[PDB]
Nucleic acid binder design. Structure first.
Ligand SMILES: Nc1ncnc2c1ncn2[C@@H]1O[C@H](COS(=O)(=O)NC(=O)[C@@H](N)CO)[C@@H](O)[C@H]1O
Ligand SMILES: Nc1ncnc2c1ncn2[C@@H]1O[C@H](COS(=O)(=O)NC(=O)[C@@H](N)CO)[C@@H](O)[C@H]1O
Lengths: 442, 319
RNA sequence: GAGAAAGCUCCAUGUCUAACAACAUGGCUUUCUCACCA
């Protein structure tokens, strides 16, 4: 019916069993209950005692198993007593199934537990979320600016009409200047990060369920938003929600030299979200976004500093583009299961009339590393778990909407910012020379 | 299988040719070790110089095509079954190259085998003005192939489930001559691109697939493989993608007619990477970067990465 | 991609053993087969 793929992975032996954090907060039950309630994840404080009790029972059984194994090893070495060995073997075999079942039940419930919440994260809804700062101002417009979809259809750059038969609902197409603008945006962000020293990386779109669970997303659920391929054609294959999931999978079960840390990887790849607005590019099933994900040093201070640098990069990119953007700290309620600290950057959209969230940065310091066993070995040779920070530099659909609506004009021409001016080759855009398509459908 | 043209000279190497995977692994650009669970089987990761090469090649080809007037375009990744049927690919058969989304979760949703299916969907049931013709648009998107052969060279980068492939799609006038000349132009453009890169290559003509009326196959000589490898496939089509999808173009008279479709591949990151790495292979394992791509990479000669390669701490290791 | 074989290029879960090993199930690494490259 319902079963995790991480416990199955550890049981089969594919990867080392993850190290849970229950022992970390077992010291004070009230603190953990308060943090979990504030996060308001799927698990609730009401159900925490059952998980803790099962864990304690599991620990006692494991200690007993270790003692019996030690006695059996001692008798075996001395003989190398037979009746005692037979009795010990019978006792251990009888106890083993029960211990395995107990472990399965406890780990199944424990996986649901979310990560620690940073004290400086406000508690409340998205509206309750605090605003860090705003760069730029709304452009003055003599007349009401039109919607991005309408401007796109008028210029024929974006085609969203009559697409159900071909691409299904919420499907969009980019043509002409729109396509060049998207390519220019991806290349401009890539070049800026490469100059900053980010190491380019490419991640496969298809990924297995274990990696997704480690990332923290729910791979299979009734309302699940991740696309899963048919089991008959292929088994345990899912479409990457974001590039960071692929990068995490690449880093799963591997070590990095201490000198290399911090490691920054920039990956550009298509992301498919089920997302189960009626029209427009605000909600799209698939889109292309450049993603910067980096694994920092063990120190939490280092992880936070890396997240701050990523935020600075996002701000510099949007300032260069010239869009009006406000950076607001995400609330505890929406932080999510795998995110410690999350920053949301919303770009003003005149046509939409509301700020739109386009960039999200998440500190996965202890959840993703523990789930996938990503660790960094120090010079002495010890292995220390490494914090991972993942953020999105830019998304073509949201940035296209913001740039088009911000630079729209009365004649219908859309101005192009100077940074993308070199890539496009035209200071502005004009009505398409080519005749727009004619619908001949019955 | 006639050889229309042969260009370039085979490189001369004192030492024996080295496989692309070995050169990449020593250089660390591409890792394909114990990636079964993480990314499925026969997937690949490009890092360091390899990623720069992939982005550089796609951007260089895109700039060259745009200079010639190609209208840039992007297509939706998810496509419906009817679109695939029109393009000549059928997912009904058990062995298929088209990934199939779960029917219960979503109905009739299939990943784009190639970018051509997306572009064909764009022109479905629509009429193009007789003056716009011919119309050539270049779309760059990742393409996923459902089945990659494991019988030969399984542990190789040559065949992969997901590869980045620039695709050029061009609609032409009613005349067969128009489509043929358009395809000829496409072939000349791709040949020029290969010559700029410097890869030795031979272009042959495929006899008679069923959807394509005519075909052109470009194979690039790779030293590490030691044998010719197909790198591009441009295949003309005549009133078939349109006649299946009901794609028609309105002439000056206004009569409805079915336009011809020509599809060509500007470049594919995996085969080009193999040929580029192998052709410039050096004694120390370093790979020379052609001057054309020097600006994009920005490094004259690739050297061993300073960062230490990743070690495996997973349970499936001898102890 | 499908099937099959082997243990190495070995790691796990179990049957009789005081216990190594020996045989099973599965993973991984190789090898042998039948098949698509739109
Ligand atoms: N249904 C959607 N359709 C199109 N674009 C979307 C959609 N949802 C979010 N986006 C865009 O994609 C970005 C992804 O941000 S996020 O999913 O919430 N966070 C991540 O993906 C983490 N991997 C960041 O490292 C958003 O900021 C927004 O710009
Ligand atoms: N398994 C594969 N892995 C990576 N690239 C591939 C693969 N198969 C084909 N290609 C790329 O796609 C090119 C054309 O082969 S093809 O997909 O069967 N034919 C087409 O793509 C044309 N119909 C338009 O793309 C190849 O030369 C190569 O560049």
């Amino acid at each position: 019916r319902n079963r995790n793929l991480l416990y199955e992975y550890a049981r089969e032996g594919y990867s080392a069993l993850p190290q849970l954090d229950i022992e970390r907060f077992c010291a004070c039950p009230e603190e953990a209950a308060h943090a979990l309630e504030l996060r308001k994840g799927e698990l609730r404080s009401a159900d925490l005692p059952a998980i803790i009790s099962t864990w304690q029972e599991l620990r006692q059984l494991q200690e007993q198993i270790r003692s019996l194994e030690e006695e059996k090893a001692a008798v075996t070495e001395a003989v190398r007593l037979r009746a005692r060995g037979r009795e010990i073997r019978k006792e251990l075999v009888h106890l083993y199934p029960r211990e395995a079942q107990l472990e399965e039940q406890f780990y199944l419930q424990a996986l649901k537990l979310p990560n620690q919440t940073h004290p400086d994260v406000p508690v409340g809804d998205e509206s309750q979320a605090r605003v860090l700062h705003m760069v730029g101002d709304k452009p003055v417009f003599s007349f009401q600016p039109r919607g991005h979809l309408e401007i796109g259809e008028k210029l024929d750059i974006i085609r969203q009409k009559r697409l159900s038969h071909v691409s299904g609902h919420r499907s969009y197409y980019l043509r002409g200047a729109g396509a060049l603008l998207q390519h220019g945006l991806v290349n401009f962000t890539f070049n800026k990060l490469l100059r900053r020293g980010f190491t380019p990386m490419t991640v496969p779109d298809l990924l297995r369920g274990a990696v997704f669970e480690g990332c923290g997303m729910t791979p299979n659920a009734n309302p699940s938003q991740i696309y899963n391929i048919d089991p008959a054609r292929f088994k345990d294959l899912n479409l990457a929600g974001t590039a960071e999931v692929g990068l995490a999978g690449y880093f799963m079960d591997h070590t990095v030299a201490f000198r290399d840390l911090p490691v920054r990887m920039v990956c550009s790849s298509t992301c498919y979200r089920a997302e189960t607005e009626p029209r427009g590019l605000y909600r799209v099933h698939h889109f292309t976004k450049v993603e910067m994900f980096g694994v920092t040093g063990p120190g939490l201070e280092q992880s936070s500093q890396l997240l701050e640098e990523f935020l600075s990069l996002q701000m510099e990119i949007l300032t260069e583009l010239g869009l009006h953007f406000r950076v607001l700290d995400m609330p505890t309620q929406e932080l999510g299961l795998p995110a410690y600290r999350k920053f949301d950057i919303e770009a003003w959209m005149p046509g939409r009339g509301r700020f739109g969230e386009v960039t999200s940065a998440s500190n996965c310091t202890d959840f993703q590393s523990r789930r996938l066993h990503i660790m960094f070995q120090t010079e002495a040779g010890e292995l220390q778990f490494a914090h991972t920070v993942n953020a999105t530099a830019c998304a073509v659909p949201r940035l296209l909407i913001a740039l088009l609506e911000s630079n729209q004009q009365k004649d219908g021409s859309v101005l192009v910012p100077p940074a993308l001016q070199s890539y496009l080759g035209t200071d502005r855009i004009t009505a398409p020379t080519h005749v727009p398509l004619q619908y001949i459908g019955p | 299988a006639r050889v229309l043209h042969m260009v370039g000279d085979k490189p001369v190497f004192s030492f024996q040719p080295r496989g692309h995977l070995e050169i990449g692994e020593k250089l660390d650009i591409i890792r394909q070790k114990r990636l079964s669970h993480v990314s499925g089987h026969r997937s690949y990761y490009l890092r360091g110089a390899g990623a720069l090469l992939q982005h550089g090649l796609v951007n260089f080809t895109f700039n060259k095509l745009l200079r010639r007037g190609f209208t840039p375009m992007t297509v939706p990744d998810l496509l419906r079954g009817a679109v695939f049927e029109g393009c000549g690919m059928t997912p009904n058969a058990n062995p298929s190259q088209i990934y199939n989304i779960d029917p219960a979760r979503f109905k009739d949703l299939n990943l784009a085998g190639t970018a051509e299916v997306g572009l064909a969907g764009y022109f479905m049931d629509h009429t193009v003005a007789f003056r716009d013709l011919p119309v050539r648009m270049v779309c760059s998107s990742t393409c996923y192939r459902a089945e990659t052969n494991t019988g030969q060279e399984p542990r190789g980068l040559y065949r992969v489930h997901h590869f980045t492939k620039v695709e050029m799609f061009g609609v032409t006038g009613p005349g067969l001559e128009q489509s043929s000349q358009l395809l000829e132009e496409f072939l000349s453009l791709q040949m020029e691109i290969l010559t700029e890169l410097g890869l030795h290559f031979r272009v042959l003509d495929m006899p008679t697939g069923l959807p394509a009326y005519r075909k052109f196959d470009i194979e690039a000589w790779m030293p590490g493989r030691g044998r010719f490898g197909e790198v591009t496939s441009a295949s003309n089509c005549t009133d078939f993608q349109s006649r299946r999808l009901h794609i028609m173009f309105q002439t000056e008279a206004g009569e409805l007619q079915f336009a011809h479709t020509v599809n060509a591949t500007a470049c594919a990151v995996p085969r080009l990477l193999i040929a580029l790495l192998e052709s410039n292979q050096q004694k120390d394992g370093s790979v020379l970067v052609p001057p054309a791509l020097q600006s994009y990479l920005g490094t004259d000669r690739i050297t061993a990465p300073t960062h230490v390669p990743l070690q495996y701490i997973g349970p499936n290791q001898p102890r």
